[PDB]
Amino acid sequence: KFVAFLDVKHFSPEDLTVK
């Protein structure tokens, strides 16, 4: 969840891991 390094973007199509 929240994988965009934006910390303000709901979800992302480039999810790699839990991070």
Describe this structure in words.
- The chain has 19 residues and is mostly loops.
- It is 0% helix and 0% strand.
- This is Alpha-crystallin A chain.
- Belongs to the small heat shock protein (HSP20) family.
- It is found in: Cytoplasm; Nucleus.
N-to-C span: 9 Å
* Number of helical segments with 4 or more residues: 0
Q: Name the beta content range.
A: under 5%
Overall SS class: little secondary structure
Number of strands: 0
Largest sheet: none
The general outline is globular
Question: What Rg, in angstroms, do the CA atoms define?
Answer: 7 Å
Helix content: under 10%
Oligomeric state: monomer
PDB class: chaperone
Keywords: Crystallin, Small heat shock protein
Assembly: monomeric
Entry title: I4A variant of mini-alphaA crystallin
Brief digest:
The chain is low in regular secondary structure and 19 residues long. The chain has no helices and no strands. The protein is globular and about 15 Å long.
Question: Which SSEs are present, and which pair or pack?
Answer:
Layout: no helix or strand
